């Protein structure tokens, strides 16, 4: 009885850290949910501690690859728009106008082949300022992105609204889920649970703000890795959502043309009504109260009395220095310089925001390609929720009382770290070894 022997045990609840692939779960067309498997059933655990660690997850690395592949292949069978890079004879549209919007809205004219390759065709059209560039009476413009990349047109029937998806794990694995209320980035979590696959994830694309996202618990939370270090980013999350309204009020017509056999090309028509400028509103009082709440949470790392000041952006391209998103099919770039104004010491109307529109886009920074976006007939409206901001700080000398904050971000990976923080992939190993007093027969 004292001389212990060894036994094995099959099916023992023990796990290890390892990372493998995932797949869909989801229930005309969108970019994503063409053909993958349709879809709760969680299981509670207790008094099991586990060291979670976001910013080092491998679930964020996999999906970031799986978006750009999903984006690209849903653009391949559409029309290759190579013969459009011609010389444009072009002038200003809507002259003698005294409003703000003057330097936009140029009216151009070019040639284009028809279905008969021996006949040609004349056409009139319009373009915004940020996509034409003069080359060295009217002047001679060309497109913004023709000397580097072959540009393509998206198919006009497919659309770009987000559809909630689930990431789901194959057999032989599991997904852990911390169910704590207050939880910073890295630390143990005393309340875990096993879920087969997760809740809905909206893959919204945005910079400098977070739209349509999930809320938090009763107190707003700041999150980073090492706040002392000024190099990393800062994730904040709200509890009460603040609304914004955005529109684009002018009326538009679209027209059609046939560049070759079977292919089709859409373009912008004219303006019926009033030349206006697209803008965004926000309720003034609740935004101020939200900033006053988030600075109270921020003071827990910098003593009681240090001067906190907000400021505008620093530089870079248009992607980051302004606020950008997609409302319903046409792409925005809003200035948002009016939301990071005056400082803070210890002792009914709304805010408007100017916002410009660009057509030719290179998202995801890849050289060689760029896409077109056809115009939308009719006026456009969007409402949304703002849940969470992206802040970074600056340096400074040793003797300092003013510590600044500028809304940065830009790197698209943090748009999913705000949502996929409470999960961790894990692998079951069902074979274990332990001793007892047993001894087999002969």
């Amino acid at each position: 009885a004292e001389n212990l022997w060894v036994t094995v045990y099959y099916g023992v609840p023990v796990w290890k850290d390892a990372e493998t692939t995932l797949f869909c779960a989801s229930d005309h067309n969108v970019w994503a949910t063409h053909a993958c498997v349709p879809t709760p059933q969680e299981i509670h655990l207790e008094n099991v501690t586990e060291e979670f660690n976001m910013w080092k997850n491998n679930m964020v690395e996999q999906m970031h690859e799986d978006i750009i592949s999903l984006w690209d292949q849903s653009l391949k069978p559409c029309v290759k728009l190579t013969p459009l890079c011609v010389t444009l004879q072009c002038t200003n549209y809507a002259p003698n106008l005294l409003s703000n919007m003057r330097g936009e809205l140029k009216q151009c004219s070019f040639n284009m082949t028809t279905e008969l390759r021996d006949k040609k065709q004349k056409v009139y059209s319009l373009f915004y300022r940020l996509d034409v560039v003069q080359i060295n009476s009217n002047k001679e413009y060309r497109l913004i992105n023709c000397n580097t990349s072959a540009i393509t047109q998206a198919c006009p029937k497919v659309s770009f609204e987000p559809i909630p998806i689930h990431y789901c794990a194959p057999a032989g694995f599991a997904i852990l889920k911390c169910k704590d209320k207050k939880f910073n980035g890295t630390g143990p979590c005393p309340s875990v649970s096993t879920v087969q696959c997760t809740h809905g994830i909206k893959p919204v694309v945005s910079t400098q703000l977070l739209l349509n996202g999930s809320l938090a618990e009763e107190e707003v939370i700041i999150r980073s890795e090492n706040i002392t270090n000024n190099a990393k980013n800062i994730l904040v999350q709200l509890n009460t959502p603040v609304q914004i309204n955005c529109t684009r009020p002018n009326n538009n017509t679209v027209k059609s043309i046939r560049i070759g056999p079977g292919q089709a090309f859409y373009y912008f028509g004219d303006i019926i009504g009033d030349i206006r400028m697209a803008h965004c509103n926000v309720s003034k009082a609740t935004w101020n109260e939200t900033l006053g709440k988030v600075v109270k949470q921020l003071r827990k790392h910098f003593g009681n009395n240090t001067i906190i000041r907000f400021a505008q952006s620093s530089g870079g391209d248009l992607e980051v220095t302004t606020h950008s998103f997609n409302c319903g099919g046409e792409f925005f770039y809003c200035n948002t310089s009016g939301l990071f104004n005056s400082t803070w010491i210890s002792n009914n109307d709304s805010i408007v925001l100017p916002c410009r529109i660009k057509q030719i886009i290179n998202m995801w920074q890849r050289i060689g390609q760029a896409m077109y976006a056809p115009p939308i007939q009719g006026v456009i409206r969007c409402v949304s929720n703002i849940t969470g901001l992206i802040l970074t700080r600056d340096g400074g000398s040793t003797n300092s009382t003013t510590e600044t904050f500028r809304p940065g971000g830009g790197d698209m990976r943090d748009n999913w770290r705000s949502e996929l923080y409470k999960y961790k992939v894990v692998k079951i190993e069902p074979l274990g070894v332990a001793p007892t007093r047993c001894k087999r027969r002969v």
């Binding site: 001389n3 212990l4 060894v6 099916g11 299981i43 069902p430 332990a434």
Partner: protein, 124 residues
């Protein structure tokens, strides 16, 4: 009542040994490559440990027993302070360096020592 999948993950080894089968029954439950690179990857992970448990002479059972001495130089605990208080997750640490040694001499010795015997006994 069945707690569910991984229900006894924080409980005592002696209590977790009461329920083992629920952890076993859930084990085998251009874009088509991803639905086959994962579907194939489940299989030999099952088949490796199935074959390893087969070669240890007790493929059919679950609570296998063998005659190999424990040799408390590996770890030195009593019978009570293993099967009453800690869980399997704490048990994984002190064993994690002896695994290839234990997997070896269990396998290479015993079933080779066994099959000599019924070859000689059924001879007579």
């Amino acid at each position: 009542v069945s707690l569910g999948f991984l229900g006894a993950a924080g409980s005592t080894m002696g209590a977790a040994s009461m329920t083992l089968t629920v952890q076993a029954r859930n084990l085998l439950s251009h874009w088509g490559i991803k639905q086959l690179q994962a579907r194939v990857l489940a299989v030999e992970h099952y088949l490796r440990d199935q074959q390893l448990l087969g070669i240890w002479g007790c493929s059919g059972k679950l609570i296998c027993c063998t005659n190999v001495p424990w040799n408390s130089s590996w770890s030195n605990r009593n019978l009570s302070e293993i099967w009453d208080n800690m869980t399997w997750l704490q048990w994984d640490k002190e064993i994690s360096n002896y695994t290839q040694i234990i997997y070896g001499l269990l396998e290479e010795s015993q079933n080779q020592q066994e099959k000599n015997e019924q070859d000689l006994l059924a001879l007579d």
